[PDB]
């Protein structure tokens, strides 16, 4: 596990990436970590926004499965040949492993400008894999061939950083990456890491909303999404609650909002808290993000002002707990026990101040027995 500390490069704005050696002899690739999908796919051709691609003809241990797969996302898709090859994770495993891999020969809106990765690692469940749940996921391959528990945890250390590293621990929990207690919330469904949101608070204040709005379709934890995404109706409630507590295409991400450095904008904004049901259903815990996490700096130090992006965008189908929230917490994907754990990330600090908080237990007498429709 200690060999896996700081095995990630990147930042929330662009994503976090793992380094991988693929095939014989090895081809080094920079792989995005996506707990929101279930395929291992890499560039298979030259493309305008990647330095490098995996050449299956240059690998003696590559073996084509003789079919291709298409994966559609919300915005952006790709189509790739499916093969098997031997992979090594240098920062974590001395031994190499045989996984399925798709080699992208057609994509649209997938490799974007300024991106550092040239592949993605789907860490979600078998049920989401394409073309079917029968295509053994990368982590399922890893569990079996590496003898590790069915658990991985993730820490991003990008808070404060200009939008324009971390650790992925495969097979458990690294105690040097947190302090305090881990709070566990059950996984409601095994496809996405779907969990149950009870309440949203904006500065100690509950939104009027019914608890089901939060799980409208589903509430998921997804490292491959940048922002905290909310169902259109919930998003509108949060904007109006934040706005009437602070002082515009800002909210909708058409404009940035700028301040001179003396103006210290981080105090004018409220804290946002998401309540989650504990394994004991009679209690809940609270994950809190400060302004520093959702009022995001664009440029970084250099000028005598800063421009800021709003780290919360609307969504149609899901409530997506993305990097905007994941930057605050060490997140434990405890597949073996069907639960997701949260602890505060010691690295989530700016100017010595924690930019996230965790606390509980709180009673759930108030809320319905099941917020999941």
């Amino acid at each position, epitope marked *: 596990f200690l060999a896996m500390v700081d095995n990630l490069q990147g930042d929330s704005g662009r994503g976090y990436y793992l380094e991988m050696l693929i095939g014989t002899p090895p081809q080094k690739l920079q792989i995005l970590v996506d707990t929101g999908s279930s395929n291992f796919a890499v560039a298979g051709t030259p493309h305008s926004y990647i330095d490098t691609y995996f050449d299956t003809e240059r690998s003696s*241990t590559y*073996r084509s*499965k003789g*079919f291709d797969v298409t994966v559609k996302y919300t915005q952006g898709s790709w189509t790739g040949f499916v093969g*098997e090859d*031997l992979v090594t994770i240098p920062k974590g495993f001395n031994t190499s492993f*045989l*996984v*399925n891999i798709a080699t992208i020969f057609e994509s649209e809106n997938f490799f974007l400008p300024g991106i550092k990765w040239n592949g993605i690692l789907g860490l979600a*469940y*078998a049920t989401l*894999a394409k073309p*079917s*749940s*029968s*295509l*053994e*996921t990368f982590f*399922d*391959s890893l*569990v*079996t*061939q*590496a*003898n590790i528990p069915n658990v991985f945890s993730m820490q991003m250390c990008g808070a404060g950083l200009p939008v324009a590293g971390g650790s992925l621990v495969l097979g458990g929990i690294e105690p040097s990456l947190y302090k305090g207690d881990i709070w566990y919330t059950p996984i409601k469904e095994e496809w996405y890491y779907q969990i149950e949101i009870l309440k949203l608070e904006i500065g100690g204040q509950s939104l009027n909303l019914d608890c089901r709005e939060y799980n409208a379709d589903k509430a998921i934890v997804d490292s491959g999404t940048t922002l905290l995404r909310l169902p259109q109706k919930v998003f509108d409630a949060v904007v109006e609650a934040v706005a009437r507590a602070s002082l515009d295409g800002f909210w909708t991400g058409s404009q940035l909002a700028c301040w001179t450095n003396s103006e210290t904008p981080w105090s004018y904004f409220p804290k946002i808290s998401i309540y989650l049901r504990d394994e004991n259903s009679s209690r809940s815990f609270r994950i809190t993000i400060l302004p520093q996490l959702y009022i995001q700096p664009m440029m970084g130090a250099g000028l005598n002002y800063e421009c800021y992006r709003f780290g919360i965008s609307p969504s149609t189908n899901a409530l997506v707990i993305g990097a905007t929230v994941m930057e605050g917490f060490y997140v434990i994907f405890d597949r073996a026990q069907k639960r997701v754990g949260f602890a505060a990330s010691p690295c989530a600090e700016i100017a010595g101040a924690a930019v996230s908080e965790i606390s509980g237990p709180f009673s759930t007498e108030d809320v319905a027995s099941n917020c999941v429709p």
Partner: nanobody
Amino acid sequence: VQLQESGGGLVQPGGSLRLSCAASGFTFSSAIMTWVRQAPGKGREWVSTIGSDGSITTYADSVKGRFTISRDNARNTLYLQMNSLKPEDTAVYYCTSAGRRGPGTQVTVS
């Protein structure tokens, strides 16, 4: 995805055994297949993996040389051939694919 292992039993040390995994409910011939064992009082141990076309085979050092993984794609069957068995091969052996496994077959080497 359904899987069924057989072939286990009580064998003497230095003996030999063939395990079988009959697979149904998915296209076996497209699937990476893996054998894992679970010895008593020990952690689960990976044994051997085989790529779908059966030309790539990998083995645990502890079985390198004695065990042979193989598959018959036409008959949706996976094999593990085990020679020079020793008391520490006593384990339940599980055939496994896409996070699914069968009920196992116990092997006892006294």
